[PDB]
Symmetry: D2
Subunit: 468 residues, 4 copies
């Protein structure tokens, strides 16, 4: 038995708030989860088409994963990274040999506890390998929240600052940590479009976003630029690049002698209907970062994978880095089980096929709803651009440069979410004009149908315009 | 089942060699140390070798290895979860916060609100962010030899040269490579270590008004840079990795100085927290209360990854008035919180703090005896299950390694006293030694037995015989 | 009776080689170029060789070399001074500020107060300090290829790769070194140059709303970083060292964008100031008024070292309410201020600004004729005595040096078209060329004669003949 | 005919204020100068025992210097640093061959226009030569005001910030420029003494301030520290180090492989009764910076002098640095004439002898005035430590960490200055509890007597409490 009234009391009183003021806050108790559902203490079932934070890839509370964790708990315990375990070694082997066995780039893995820690590690390694300070990121990128990872996060609304309650006159950024001269922000891949929706290219066929990135690196000196960090689909920032963007970035970093880090924390492990997001583009990175679907959130884990060449350099030195929980044997047992289930049950193909189905459903919704400007994605990771049906332009002018100071009653994705909730479906987004949709890789056709029906309903309400 | 061999450890060793990034060792020198299972204060190797761990890993398995009540509690949580992120409420997350604030610190008035994260470094990142936002000021003051974590923000306040995630050579001190760009935008002042400013008679120096010179100089730095731009002073009451104990008055004087200057005091309890020092928290030895503490390690006794920051009522009331745009995927992970809950409940119910206090007194008496027969023990200090032992050359009474806490791991371990001691102790099936070259750093579980303490001290005895013989050099 | 000036010029050259630090040249490639005296647009060597200077040194001797009225005025001030620092008042310092505000800019309401310093870089340092203090915000936005000076603060906003006080190799672009540590703490964003987004015809790209793409992305960057932490955008209306002219619409769009975002606009007039462009200031071509300008060069026409910053009435009123703890020894130097006063008085009385406009129109007609005869001229643009000429391969109409304004001085000058032009024109006793590899940057005194313009254009004619006669390749 | 009332009106209206609010500001017009005197429009003569900013070493309006400037103006004009002149080359030769002819360290000079610019250049060269970023400065050092030079200025009251009018209700440091991680602040010399004034030395005889500086460099890594920058007597910061401090810094930097930059902008050119301040200490630096006495403020000039080995390194590269007015030939003619006069008329020995006389005068004042706690100095550069006689402690607690937000009616050096002005003498200090006395190197015994008499009168007043 649980006193949920007491839980709510303690949650209100003793926990720090995020995104909501204490004034406006209402706790949202979840007593248990299963598959694509969250279950409230009263038994209310919610179909979660956020997949929490696009991170419960295998499905909620997988029985084989949970059984694997229980077995680990018969032996461990805790040992730190200086000590070797079967679970930690096997996890690395599964990634390099089993998942990426068809590719030549992978060298060595370091496990840590979170995706932000993975990005911190990737940044440190890239800089040490090149012996150079600068890293290039893009407008709207999200790469985590800790001090180093945040420097490459250029998503205004997710930088751990403070904003006001329904007033945008009160932005307070973290003093001493609100900009960083060791990072250059390049344009979003989506920045250079003409009035007809056509892509701008230079006379050599290079996308203008890539050409501008090249020029920034030339100006600062390629000799001081360690790496370009990307997301193949911006996750929190909610965007899909032109197809040619990632291949051209791979080519340009090669030409300039700069590393390419692709952040796979969100796109990794089947999320996009391939093992990794980069694999849609016929290229290979120098470093990837991992989290979320690495363990499908069963326990906290993150990881960095570096190329053979980078691993060979690191192997020649003593690296003076310690993280207490890095390599935690029970977390690694969860990772092994998660990856074994994904492989054995062909979760990646399930994702590919289900994305193809989602594409079909969104096509039909776009024909019925003029507030849908476009949609794109793959696997279980979709964006839907929301516009005013009458003007065909976004409702929120600041768009991906908005802050959470905004009243949610002015925000289309918040209006959509609140309405879809009436049908027992959690669906919406994190940007104001852009849906961000994701479920478990093994989500059923019936649950996709139920989600799309709730979205159908929310879009009817949005287009009625009676919220205004 | 028909299986008689669940794990092929030869295969594990090859994978570990081939596929895992090294730390502290080059690939060429690396000798893997596989651990198949743990229990209490013991690690068990796949060949059955049992090692008594007087490092308690990283001074972080406070409850003991593989506590059966904690592991059962984790298994129970797995009937229900699953994963929800911090926007959702769970019983385990809310109860964890309540145990800290109401139960453990119910006698204190400063505590306000907790944010849970996954590691001690993430806790420190969070504390720094909050201190800077609350004060609207950028600078944080740390101390020489402090260790506060490894991630970009936490590392800015880490001034322990050998633990800043840089690269050093294999038995050569000539190839230091620090991470390029890592101090761009750092907003940090390094104040003196507490143990700076000693006289030849070993006493810590004070001014005419009795202010320690370490504190007086910290005050001068804050005045010089402008108190109006200094958010916080961050401390460890006992430097963990840095391996130092401050004079008794240092922590009280830092509380006084920060109050007088209008600056916050963050005490980093990631290592000293949860009974490590024979009180619930390290700061409680000093009769003062901080504005913010950071936690990890003993928070879950390493059962699952957890960290936390606890802020004062004043700070929590401020943060409550704003929308805080900060997200961490695993922050508040319900299964991790179930582990914290169980760890803390066992700790409370079985009086682990008093067990630590009592065993510390017993350790003190064993070290007294060791100092009487070993001139290589210059001095020792500590409390609960956290001890430093200053090692010196018995004939000169001066440390062997000149750079001391400013050493790097570029050094050959065959020249390092704490490495010599460790290597010899292992012959007795005991892991004991330290992080710094001239200083032992000793810890075990809070419920460690008297027999296990005796076993470890006998091993140290044997190791010191060998150091003092000078056969190693 | 005749007191001959005792100068051994071979000894001077020896001393210059041995005792003075080199810039732009290695010691081994360096040959000193002694100049004994100057007059009007001419440099005179010790042997009496005369050189017509169509660089006007650094586009900075606006009034002409060794103007008798200015020099008499300096000699007069030396009857009285001496030196006093800025806490003391003099007639010369107060008059210089009055001339700028009430006699030059009396037709505009923005000007408030001046601070005099000794150099253009010092003026930019001061402007950055004031913009940040007034707004209480850290970030300043500059543009790719801007040059704003060389001192630590001014260099942060200089994004001209080849002019940031680093080291490059001798005819090798593989060994170089930027100054370590110089960008720790820098609070600067680099926005696109005004010329960055062009089409095949040469038109600058605009969005459907009519906003230049360069401006659009500048605004996006400010939005992303938070307009609440952006103090200012700093610009040059014509990139001086960077050698570029904006589309007419850029500056009005920047003025509008800054007003809309609540950000200051600093226009750097150190090069374009004081008649250089055929108006008093470069910004005056664009129908707008800035919040702050920086001055140097033509401020005194290099007669003595002076720089200045002029801030708006609203900025001045804010600064006036506080005690500003800033001192510079030579700021307001009374004899340098005497030079400024006389330079400006001569410029006004003899209508040099009007003379410069007229001569620019003349130069325009001369360049038109050169372009019709020389296919190596792709385009040219300018005003007054500041001209850019885009140099291209005559057959392709595209530039020879691909890195263009991102080149370094590591390049061999026998590969740089502007170096080739300079070397050839020298045979005709004319100094003319550029700072960037594909772009001429032409300037003389505001009172340059038609005969000297004709002589310079003749030498260029000769130079371009040789460039497009495939012999240098 | 000059209209000085109109001058005062223009000065108030059109010039930015420093140290004073507009509201409290009273302009102080100076019509001419001569020797150690400033002359007001009404003929009032003021004996200047600040020597402006300790920078008019030769005396005001030296006729030989002014004649030399006039001669240069018959030839120039302006050429920038790429061209050679007799004046620029001769100035460098005078410094290296004539003044420093007895020393082996000097290599090459770069002339610039100000002391701050000299410091900027020195920092750049030290960092390029070593290929290292960090520079160590000391608490209370003043090394100039420009962005780079200001990073090593750790004098709280002189960092180009804003403070209030007789209040603490408004205070503001420059955003983005109020600290710098590429600089480490080491302790001031005399860091801590024991209660009897004994210097704290370790078992190797190393002073505490030096030992701690060494520890900082070890902690940050000597491989990343370019230089230690010092003033042998802190000028604005108003302090004299123990004799052994500078020698031990020279020794320590050599042992650690770190450069020593000694900032001679204020102590240079006879100020201390030697050609350079460092010459009191039997050591040679790697780099010095120069200004002030370099031209005795006749025209703006600064300079950096680097060692033979540093010069040999820079000579191998193309250095992409331009400063328009660096090497200005008329400024260089002034430097030449200034240094020639100093040499020919033995101004350095004049300074030394007058320093000895000043010492005897201050000894007599201390016998008579218990508000004089101590005094020290050399040549024409002195400090006098002022204390409340009845408590034996300084009146202003914050001491060298004060700000100009204080009311000047509470500041001992302000009270002294105001009373001394009744005798037509300008004398006082920069810091609240410390006199900073300087005059021209050729100041007469009669003027020293007049200044000391005015100080005696001022100290009677201070000790009377009547100001309080
Ligand atoms: C969520 C995320 C991170 C950070 O992961 P955490 O586990 O939340 O620290 C980093 N990068 C990307 C692309 C992400 O989506
Ligand atoms: C170990 C430690 C940390 C960092 O904790 P991790 O969980 O290793 O990130 C922070 N502070 C102190 C005092 C520590 O001992
Ligand atoms: C020359 C120049 C400066 C710097 O002036 P200095 O007197 O050389 O310090 C600054 N801004 C611009 C636009 C310049 O052309
Ligand atoms: C005055 C001074 C400077 C700066 O000189 P300016 O000419 O005022 O720029 C630098 N260092 C010291 C020690 C000084 O006294």
């Amino acid at each position: 038995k649980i006193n949920w009234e007491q839980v709510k009391e303690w949650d209100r009183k003793y926990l720090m708030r995020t995104f909501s003021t204490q004034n406006e806050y209402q706790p949202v108790p979840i007593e248990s989860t299963e598959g694509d559902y969250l279950i409230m203490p009263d038994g209310t079932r919610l179909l979660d088409f956020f997949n929490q934070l696009y991170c419960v890839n295998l499905g909620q509370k997988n029985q084989k994963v949970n059984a694997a964790i229980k077995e680990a708990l018969d032996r461990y315990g805790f040992v730190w990274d200086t000590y070797a375990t079967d679970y930690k070694a096997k996890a690395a082997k599964i990634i390099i040999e089993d998942i990426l066995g068809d590719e030549d780039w992978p060298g060595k893995v370091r496990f840590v506890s979170t995706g932000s820690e993975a990005v911190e590690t990737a940044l440190n390694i890239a800089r040490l390998y090149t012996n150079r300070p600068l890293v290039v990121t893009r407008e709207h990128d999200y790469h985590g929240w800790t001090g180093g990872a945040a420097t490459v996060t250029r998503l205004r609304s997710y930088r751990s600052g403070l904003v006001g309650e329904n007033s945008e006159s009160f932005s307070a950024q973290i003093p001493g940590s609100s900009y960083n001269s060791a990072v250059l922000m390049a344009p979003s891949p989506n920045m250079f479009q003409d009035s007809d929706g056509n892509l701008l290219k230079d006379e050599n066929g290079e996308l203008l976003s890539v050409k501008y990135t090249r020029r920034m690196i030339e100006n600062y000196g390629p000799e001081q630029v360690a790496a370009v960090i990307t997301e193949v689909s911006q996750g929190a920032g909610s965007a899909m690049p032109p197809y040619e963007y990632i291949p051209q970035i791979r080519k340009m970093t090669k030409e300039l002698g700069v590393l390419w880090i692709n952040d796979e924390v969100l796109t990794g492990f089947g999320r996009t209907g391939k093992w990794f997001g980069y694999q849609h583009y016929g290229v290979q990175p120098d470093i990837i970062t991992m989290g979320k679907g690495l363990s499908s959130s069963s326990l906290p884990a993150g990881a960095v994978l570096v190329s053979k060449e980078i691993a060979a350099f690191m192997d020649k030195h003593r690296w003076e880095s310690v993280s207490t929980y890095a390599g935690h044997p029970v977390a690694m047992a969860a990772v092994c089980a998660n990856l074994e289930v994904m492989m054995e049950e062909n979760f990646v193909e399930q994702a590919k096929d289900s994305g193809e189905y989602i594409r079909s459903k969104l096509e039909l919704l776009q024909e019925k709803h003029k507030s849908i400007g476009n949609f794109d994605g793959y696997g279980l990771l979709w964006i839907v651009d929301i516009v005013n049906a009458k003007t065909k332009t976004p409702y929120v002018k600041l768009d991906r440069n908005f802050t959470h100071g905004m009243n949610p009653n002015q925000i289309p994705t918040q209006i959509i979410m609140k309405k879809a909730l009436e049908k027992g479906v959690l669906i919406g987004g994190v940007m104001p004009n852009t849906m961000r949709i994701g479920a478990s890789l093994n989500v059923s056709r019936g649950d996709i149908d139920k989600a799309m029906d709730a979205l159908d309903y929310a879009l009817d309400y949005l287009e009625s315009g009676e919220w205004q």
